[PDB]
Amino acid sequence: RPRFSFSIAAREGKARTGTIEMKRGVIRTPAFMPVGTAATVKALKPETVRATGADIILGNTYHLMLRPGAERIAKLGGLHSFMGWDRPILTDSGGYQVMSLSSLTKQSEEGVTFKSHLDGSRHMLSPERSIEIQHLLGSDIVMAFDECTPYPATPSRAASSMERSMRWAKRSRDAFDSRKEQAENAALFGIQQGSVFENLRQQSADALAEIGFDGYAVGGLAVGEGQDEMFRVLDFSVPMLPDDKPHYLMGVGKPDDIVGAVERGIDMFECVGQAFTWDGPINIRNARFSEDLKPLDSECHCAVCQKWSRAYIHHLIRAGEILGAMLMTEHNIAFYQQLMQKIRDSISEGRFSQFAQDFRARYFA
Amino acid sequence: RPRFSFSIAAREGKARTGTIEMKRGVIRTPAFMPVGTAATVKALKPETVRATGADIILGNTYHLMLRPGAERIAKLGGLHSFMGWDRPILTDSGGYQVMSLSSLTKQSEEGVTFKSHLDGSRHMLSPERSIEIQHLLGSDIVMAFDECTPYPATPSRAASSMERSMRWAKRSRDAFDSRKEQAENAALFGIQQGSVFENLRQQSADALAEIGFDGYAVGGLAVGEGQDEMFRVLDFSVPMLPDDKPHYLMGVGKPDDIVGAVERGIDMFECVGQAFTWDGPINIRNARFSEDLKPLDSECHCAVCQKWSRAYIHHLIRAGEILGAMLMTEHNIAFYQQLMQKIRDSISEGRFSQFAQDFRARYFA
Ligand SMILES: NCc1c[nH]c2nc(N)[nH]c(=O)c12
Ligand SMILES: NCc1c[nH]c2nc(N)[nH]c(=O)c12
Numbered sequence: 088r089p090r091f092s093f094s095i096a097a098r099e100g101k102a103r104t105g106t107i108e109m110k111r112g113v114i115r116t117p118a119f120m121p122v123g124t125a126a127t128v129k130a131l132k133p134e135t136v137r138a139t140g141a142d143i144i145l146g147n148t149y150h151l152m153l154r155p156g157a158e159r160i161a162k163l164g165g166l167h168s169f170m171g172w173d174r175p176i177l178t179d180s181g182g183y184q185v186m187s188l189s190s191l192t193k194q195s196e197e198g199v200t201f202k203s204h205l206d207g208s209r210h211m212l213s214p215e216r217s218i219e220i221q222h223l224l225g226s227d228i229v230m231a232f233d234e235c236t237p238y239p240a241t242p243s244r245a246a247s248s249m250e251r252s253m254r255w256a257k258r259s260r261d262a263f264d265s266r267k268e269q270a271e272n273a274a275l276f277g278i279q280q281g282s283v284f285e286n287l288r289q290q291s292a293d294a295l296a297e298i299g300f301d302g303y304a305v306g307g308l309a310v311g312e313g314q315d316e317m318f319r320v321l322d323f324s325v326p327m328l329p330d331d332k333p334h335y336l337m338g339v340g341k342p343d344d345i346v347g348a349v350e351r352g353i354d355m356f357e358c359v360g361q362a363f364t365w366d367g368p369i370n371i372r373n374a375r376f377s378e379d380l381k382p383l384d385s386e387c388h389c390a391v392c393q394k395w396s397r398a399y400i401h402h403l404i405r406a407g408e409i410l411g412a413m414l415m416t417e418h419n420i421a422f423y424q425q426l427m428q429k430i431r432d433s434i435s436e437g438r439f440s441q442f443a444q445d446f447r448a449r450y451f452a
Numbered sequence: 453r454p455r456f457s458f459s460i461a462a463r464e465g466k467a468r469t470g471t472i473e474m475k476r477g478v479i480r481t482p483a484f485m486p487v488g489t490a491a492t493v494k495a496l497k498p499e500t501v502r503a504t505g506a507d508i509i510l511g512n513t514y515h516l517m518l519r520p521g522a523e524r525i526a527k528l529g530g531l532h533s534f535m536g537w538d539r540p541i542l543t544d545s546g547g548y549q550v551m552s553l554s555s556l557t558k559q560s561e562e563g564v565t566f567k568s569h570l571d572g573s574r575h576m577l578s579p580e581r582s583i584e585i586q587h588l589l590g591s592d593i594v595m596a597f598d599e600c601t602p603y604p605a606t607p608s609r610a611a612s613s614m615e616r617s618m619r620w621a622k623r624s625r626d627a628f629d630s631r632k633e634q635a636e637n638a639a640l641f642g643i644q645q646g647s648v649f650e651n652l653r654q655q656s657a658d659a660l661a662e663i664g665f666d667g668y669a670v671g672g673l674a675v676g677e678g679q680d681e682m683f684r685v686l687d688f689s690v691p692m693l694p695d696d697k698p699h700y701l702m703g704v705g706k707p708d709d710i711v712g713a714v715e716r717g718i719d720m721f722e723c724v725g726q727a728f729t730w731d732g733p734i735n736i737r738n739a740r741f742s743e744d745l746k747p748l749d750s751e752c753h754c755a756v757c758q759k760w761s762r763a764y765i766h767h768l769i770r771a772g773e774i775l776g777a778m779l780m781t782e783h784n785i786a787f788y789q790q791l792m793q794k795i796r797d798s799i800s801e802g803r804f805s806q807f808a809q810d811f812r813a814r815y816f817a
């Protein structure tokens with residue numbers, strides 16, 4: 088029932104477990120957020136997303152502002168009613184996908200203009216318009232509009248981009264705050280930049296803390312630097328952020344990356360023929376599964392593993408059948424939610440370090 | 453609980469309503485059978501197919517004998533356990549799709565040899581092998597292997613093909629009967645041929661009745677002759693079949709075709725951006741639905757119409773999202789099951805002629 092309340096129930100090292108309370112529901116942390124692109128978590132009904140244990144989903148902004156359009160979604164009642172998900176939704180700012188999926192983008196201090204990847208339509212995106220679009224969609228957790236930094240990045244370019252990002256973070260803060268219904272009902276997260284440079288991460292964290300946000304993302308990672316480098320940067324970056332607010336690592340979702348990131352103080356993650364299993368991923372298209380009657384994973388509690396075999400799913404995926412996508416997706420998102428649950432429980436019980444060890448021994452065996 | 457028992461509970465004119473009792477369940481007639489191709493009713497879990505009200509599904513034989521293979525399905529426990537549908541399955545003989553989807557087919561009195569449409573693999577299909585494959589899949593209702601007749605067809609060619617079909621019907625009968633487990637647990641339907649020729653339909657019906665089957669299909673229609681011609685042929689063809697056994701019209705599923713066919717004594721049908729509504733079909737991709745908050749149909753009891761709007765489904769289909777296929781398919785199969793229910797109830801209440809009238813007035817308004 089409050090607009091936003093993050094409470095930490097238990098800790099182990101840098102790891103934390105707790106809850107974020109919002110108007111539309113409670114979010115258990117560490118949290119994994121399935122991703123909705125074009126107002127759908129691909130191949131799943133929202134009731135099925137919920138059934139896997141998800142407390143919140145991410146809505147990509149870029150595709151919705153192109154199709155079906157933010158204004159139209161607002162006229163139709165907002166994203167939650169449009170897609171039939173009534174729990175929190177975190178929306179991205181749209182900047183990532185502009186720069187990664189759009190064309191003829193022209194960047195400047197005001198923002199970015201671009202042509203979409205689908206048509207030739209002209210479009211504009213600034214801190215102000217991004218916050219507006221997230222409002223029109225009815226987002227619960229709004230992300231500040233930033234300027235991401237390619238990897239690798241020179242210190243000068245990483246600095247310029249981080250600085251611009253902090254200027255846009257203030258503009259984001261003010262746009263959000265000047266819209267009463269959004270300010271009163273949603274939350275706003277700021278994004279830390281700085282590439283792999285500690286001094287720049289520090290300056291960014293300081294700037295963001297000065298402005299003040301409900302949560303802080305670590306942006307700029309998982310863009311080519313490798314897990315070792317990513318963890319090294321997290322080692323010094325996450326402590327710079329306010330302890331008492333949630334920490335979201337953008338673009339990170341491999342099971343092992345999630346475990347090590349939680350070990351480094353991260354609280355929120357998203358979804359980035361592969362099936363996850365506690366013994367490591369499998370590619371279900373491999374011929375070795377064509378007569379395998381076992382479920383995708385031997386322990387998994389999901390409906391898919393209760394009800395269908397590897398052999399059947401192998402057949403469906405090789406045949407390009409939609410049910411194959413449906414089943415593979417339900418299992419994988421369930422597997423991630425079970426990972427998060429095991430993480431939450433082990434932290435609450437002060438045995439997370441052990442969990443991490445055990446998980447890795449078997450997942451890479 | 454018996455292998456096969458068809459009981460007629462009520463009649464109106466040539467229309468009948470009742471039940472087929474089989475080991476795996478009861479089938480309400482007139483029945484609409486969703487089609488499973490490659491061991492899946494496209495984009496639906498079997499629990500969802502059931503939820504729409506389906507009592508039985510059709511399994512296409514052709515694709516399964518190519519992928520995943522009949523022998524493999526039998527090793528894995530049969531089609532019902534492979535795909536997770538535990539109720540009756542009617543399997544087609546595979547002949548239709550050979551001739552329509554395969555290559556280098558060489559026909560003869562023994563059967564057909566062909567190369568599949570996917571690979572270059574060589575294959576053979578006779579009455580005996582078709583019955584064997586249906587057994588390997590664990591079919592509850594087995595279709596005799598026939599030689600369908602192109603439309604239009606000359607009387608000589610229609611006669612030759614019908615005669616061959618009756619010879620193969622006997623071979624089908626004997627193959628089925630000589631396999632104890634199949635004979636004791638499954639049912640066998642024969643197929644009437646003869647194109648649009650009354651004398652040939654009569655000879656075929658006689659031949660099939662002499663051999664004896666658990667049910668009789670009307671084959672050879674819905675292959676280009678138009679609804680008027682189709683109904684004209686049904687007018688004289690269906691009475692030639694045994695009254696006390698079910699009558700299956702192959703390849704017929706338009707809602708109006710179903711109503712008129714039931715009016716002519718047919719008991720079983722199958723599935724052949726279009727959404728069915730009681731006011732006629734709509735194409736949900738039309739721009740007129742982009743901000744339409746109404747459900748696909750205003751009366752439909754399905755989960756889709758409870759939970760999502762035209763506008764949302766329009767968006768999903770235009771975006772090529774899998775959930776769009778999922779939702780459109782669940783609604784359409786539910787709509788057909790509701791049509792069948794209204795048909796069964798109106799016959800039981802002696803008001804089917806009125807239902808038919810009313811249905812057509814509004815569906816074509
Ligand atoms: N590189 C991490 C990442 C993934 N998606 C993101 N989107 C934005 N706007 N910024 C970011 O840093 C990220
Ligand atoms: N033309 C009706 C039809 C559809 N599918 C069928 N399959 C076979 N084997 N014979 C048939 O007559 C039909």
Ligand SMILES: [Zn+2]
Nearest residue numbers: 387389392418
């Ligand atoms: Zn599973």
Ligand SMILES: [Zn+2]
Nearest residue numbers: 752754757783
């Ligand atoms: Zn419906």
